[PDB]
Every structure is written in structure tokens, then in C-alpha cells.
Amino acid sequence: IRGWIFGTTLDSKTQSLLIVNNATNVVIKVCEFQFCNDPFLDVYYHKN
Amino acid sequence: GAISSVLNDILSRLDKVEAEVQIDRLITGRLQSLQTYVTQQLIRAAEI
Amino acid sequence: NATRFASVYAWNRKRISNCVADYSVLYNFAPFFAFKCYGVSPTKLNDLCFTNVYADSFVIRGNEVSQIAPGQTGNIADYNYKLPDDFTGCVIAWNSNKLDSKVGGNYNYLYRLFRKSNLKPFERDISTEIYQAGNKPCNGVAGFNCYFPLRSYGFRPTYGVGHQPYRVVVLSFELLHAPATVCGPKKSTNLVK
Amino acid sequence: NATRFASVYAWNRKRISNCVADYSVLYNFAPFFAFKCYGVSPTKLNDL
Amino acid sequence: DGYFKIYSKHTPINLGRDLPQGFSALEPLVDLPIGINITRFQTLLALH
Numbered sequence: 160i161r162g163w164i165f166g167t168t169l170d171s172k173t174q175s176l177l178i179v180n181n182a183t184n185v186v187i188k189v190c191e192f193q194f195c196n197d198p199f200l201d202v203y204y205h206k207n
Numbered sequence: 208g209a210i211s212s213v214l215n216d217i218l219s220r221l222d223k224v225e226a227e228v229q230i231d232r233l234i235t236g237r238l239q240s241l242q243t244y245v246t247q248q249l250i251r252a253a254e255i
Numbered sequence: 256n257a258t259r260f261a262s263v264y265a266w267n268r269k270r271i272s273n274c275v276a277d278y279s280v281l282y283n284f285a286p287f288f289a290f291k292c293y294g295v296s297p298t299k300l301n302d303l304c305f306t307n308v309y310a311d312s313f314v315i316r317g318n319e320v321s322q323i324a325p326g327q328t329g330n331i332a333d334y335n336y337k338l339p340d341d342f343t344g345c346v347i348a349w350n351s352n353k354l355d356s357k358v359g360g361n362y363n364y365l366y367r368l369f370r371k372s373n374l375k376p377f378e379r380d381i382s383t384e385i386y387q388a389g390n391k392p393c394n395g396v397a398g399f400n401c402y403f404p405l406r407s408y409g410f411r412p413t414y415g416v417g418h419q420p421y422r423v424v425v426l427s428f429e430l431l432h433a434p435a436t437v438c439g440p441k442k443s444t445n446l447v448k
Numbered sequence: 449n450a451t452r453f454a455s456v457y458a459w460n461r462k463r464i465s466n467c468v469a470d471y472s473v474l475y476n477f478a479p480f481f482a483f484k485c486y487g488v489s490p491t492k493l494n495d496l
Numbered sequence: 497d498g499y500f501k502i503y504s505k506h507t508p509i510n511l512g513r514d515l516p517q518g519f520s521a522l523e524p525l526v527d528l529p530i531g532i533n534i535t536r537f538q539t540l541l542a543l544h
């Protein structure tokens with residue numbers, strides 16, 4: 160589990176909240192977002 | 208009905224124009240508390 | 256001393272922290288129009304420390320400067336910017352047409368009188384949608400007697416006597432209830448026990 | 449909204465009755481400096 | 497009133513039972529002055 164999203168409309172019609180935790184720190188941000196219907200983190204080994 | 212019960216708070220953030228009235232309420236409520244306490248104590252003393 | 260302010264529909268809140276808040280520089284910077292405080296006395300601001308000072312910043316018309324007082328009602332207090340009745344802090348305001356007004360008008364300070372209901376305290380709404388002020392569902396960019404954020408005001412310099420733009424900072428903060436960060440310019444002593 | 453006003457020595461008086469007293473469509477027509485009320489609050493006038 | 501507030505705790509718990517009958521209390525973490533309407537939310541999963 161890595162965090163949360165919170166809001167009123169969740170579809171860029173208004174402002175909404177994103178919280179995310181990764182291997183060393185959080186980010187918290189509040190933007191007029193267009194979220195996806197199913198949010199998740201694709202966190203993979205990048206060869207480059 | 209004052210901004211705080213702690214008399215030092217009123218004297219830390221209000222001046223004589225405002226601190227005076229804030230203290231008056233606390234005087235009016237605390238004096239009544241003493242009046243009630245003694246009233247009960249005089250009624251109990253009559254029973255003892 | 257910012258170049259421009261935020262418009263009061265989208266009022267800009269900046270956090271003051273980890274610093275010394277001497278207010279003497281604020282009025283030695285600019286001879287204000289107002290310096291009005293709630294839950295504190297102006298004389299005591301030097302003797303105290305504030306847990307979290309917060310500067311709301313916006314521009315407001317001279318006829319509406321007093322509408323920033325707690326619990327009052329009227330368009331800006333009903334839809335754009337509201338402080339709660341238990342407001343702690345101070346409101347500073349000053350005239351700004353000398354820096355902030357244009358001979359034709361400064362049509363950049365959009366402000367809204369069109370909302371579904373009175374706004375909540377310390378809330379900011381940027382939803383510039385065609386509000387249904389008409390008796391029918393106004394849809395598309397416009398509709399019957401329906402409008403989004405009013406198209407600002409005629410901020411023209413020699414025109415608006417007591418009615419031109421004023422610059423406003425609402426310092427909102429609480430103190431003596433939690434660890435206080437920003438403090439006054441008083442300097443500490445050695446500690447005795 | 450009227451042409452002239454009966455001067456204060458001879459002040460005018462109109463009884464308004466059998467009607468719905470919306471304030472909202474008329475207080476906005478004439479911007480004013482003084483809106484004081486003495487046993488009622490301006491926010492409640494609409495619901496009395 | 498605009499602020500979004502968070503609290504948290506970590507309890508060491510045995511193989512006997514989850515969400516257990518004991519007692520613990522959450523300390524606060526951080527306060528976000530977001531000034532936006534919350535009404536819904538969703539947690540965030542990671543998929544490597």
C-alpha cells in the first residue's frame with residue numbers, strides 16, 4: 160500500500176488531493192486532477 | 208464566556224481596553240463558585 | 256511588496272514559519288489604511304509567539320475592505336473569502352491604485368457572485384462554471400441570465416475615490432495552544448531554576 | 449428608487465402589506481454605506 | 497475548516513489475533529492547509 164487520493168469530484172472539474180509514499184519519503188500534492196478510474200503505481204526495474 | 212479560563216492568557220494577548228472585561232466574567236463566575244461552595248458548607252455545618 | 260496580488264476568488268495563502276515576525280517593518284514599509292486585530296491586541300504582538308502565522312493575500316475594493324471582518328455578510332464573505340467567527344489574527348489593508356490601477360481599468364481581478372450556496376470558512380473555489388442563476392439548466396459556455404465569475408471591476412485611478420483597489424493581507428494564526436514557531440522580536444535570557 | 453425625498457422636517461411614511469418581502473433583488477440595486485438592524489439580523493430577514 | 501489532519505500508530509501484534517482487543521492511541525503527524533472539499537477517497541496499490 161502506498162497512499163491515498165481524496166476529493167469532491169476526482170475528474171478535474173475541481174481541485175483534489177493526492178498523497179503518495181515511496182521507498183524513502185512522502186509527497187503530498189493538491190491539483191485539479193483528472194484521475195484514472197483505477198489508480199496504482201507501476202514501480203519496476205528500469206535497465207537504462 | 209471569556210476567550211480562555213487562564214487569566215495569564217488574557218494578560219498575554221489583550222490590553223486594558225479588552226483584558227479588563229475578559230477578567231470581569233471570570234471574576235463574576237469564580238465569585239459565584241465561592242458563594243455556592245460556602246452556601247453548601249454552611250448548610251452542611253448546620254447538619255454536623 | 257509583491258508585483259501583483261491574487262484575485263479574491265482564488266485568494267493566495269502563504270505560510271509564515273521558522274522566522275522572527277517584527278510588525279514594525281510592515282507599517283514603516285507602507286502607511287496602511289487599516290490594522291485591525293481580533294483575539295489579540297496590537298501592543299502585545301511583540302511579546303508572543305505564533306504556532307503557525309498564515310498570510311492570506313488578495314485585492315479588494317474600498318467599499319468592501321470592512322466586509323473582511325469576522326461573521327459579516329455580503330458577496331466576498333458569502334462566496335469568495337470567509338474567515339470563521341472565532342478568527343485569531345489581524346487584517347491589514349492599504350490603498351494600491353498608485354501601483355495596481357490602469358487608466359482604462361485593470362480587468363484581471365475576476366471575482367464571483369455566482370455559487371450554489373454560501374462558501375465554507377477558509378475554502379477556495381476555482382470552479383468557473385456557468386452557474387444556473389436563471390430558472391432553467393444553462394449549459395455550454397453561457398445561458399439565459401447565467402454568468403461565471405463577474406468580469407472584474409473598473410479599477411481606474413482618478414475615478415474610484417475611496418472605491419479603487421486596496422491591497423489586503425489577513426494574517427490568520429493561533430498562539431498559546433500548541434508549540435509556537437514564528438515569534439516576536441524579543442530576545443531570550445539565560446534560564447534559572 | 450424615487451424622484452425626490454420628503455425633507456426630514458416632514459418625513460414620508462409608506463405602509464407595505466400583503467406581499468413577499470424579498471430583500472435580495474433590491475439591496476443589490478442601490479449600493480450603500482449603512483445597513484444597520486436593531487432586533488433582527490440581515491442574514492435572517494429572508495426567513496421571517 | 498479547511499485543514500486536513502492526519503494521525504498514526506504501529507502496534508506489534510502476535511500470531512493469535514489481528515485488529516486486537518488491547519489499547520493504543522494515535523499521535524498526530526502533519527497538517528495540510530489544503531482549503532478544498534473532500535467527499536470521496538481511494539487507497540493506492542503498487543504493482544512492480
Ligand SMILES: *[C@@H]1O[C@H](CO)[C@@H](O[C@@H]2O[C@H](CO)[C@@H](O[C@H]3O[C@H](CO)[C@@H](O)[C@H](O)[C@@H]3O)[C@H](O)[C@H]2NC(C)=O)[C@H](O)[C@H]1NC(C)=O
Pocket residue numbers: 181182183184186
Ligand atoms: C520518492 O519520490 C520523490 C518525489 O518523486 C523523489 O524525490 C525527488 O528526487 C529527485 C532526485 O533526488 C529530486 O530532483 C532534484 O534532486 C536534487 C535536489 O538537491 C538536485 O541535485 C537535482 O538536480 C534535482 O533538482 C526531486 O526534487 C525530488 N522530488 C521531491 C518532490 O522532493 C525520491 O527520490 C523518491 N524516492 C525514491 C527512493 O525513489
Ligand SMILES: *[C@@H]1O[C@H](CO)[C@@H](O[C@@H]2O[C@H](CO)[C@@H](O)[C@H](O)[C@H]2NC(C)=O)[C@H](O)[C@H]1NC(C)=O
Pocket residue numbers: 167168371373374375533534535
Ligand atoms: C462539497 O462537496 C459535496 C459533494 O460533491 C457537495 O455536496 C453536494 O451538494 C449538492 C448541492 O446541494 C448536491 O446536489 C449534491 O448531491 C451533493 N453531493 C453529495 C455527494 O452529497 C457540497 O455541496 C460541497 N460543499 C461545498 C461548500 O461546495
Ligand SMILES: *[C@@H]1O[C@H](CO)[C@@H](O)[C@H](O)[C@H]1NC(C)=O
Pocket residue numbers: 256284
Ligand atoms: C519594493 O520593491 C522595489 C522594487 O519593485 C524596491 O525598489 C524597494 O526597495 C522594495 N521595498 C522594500 C521595503 O523592500
Ligand SMILES: *[C@@H]1O[C@H](CO)[C@@H](O)[C@H](O)[C@H]1NC(C)=O
Pocket residue numbers: 449450478
Ligand atoms: C431611479 O430609477 C431611474 C430609472 O432607472 C434612474 O434614472 C434613477 O437614477 C434612479 N434613482 C436612484 C436614486 O437610484
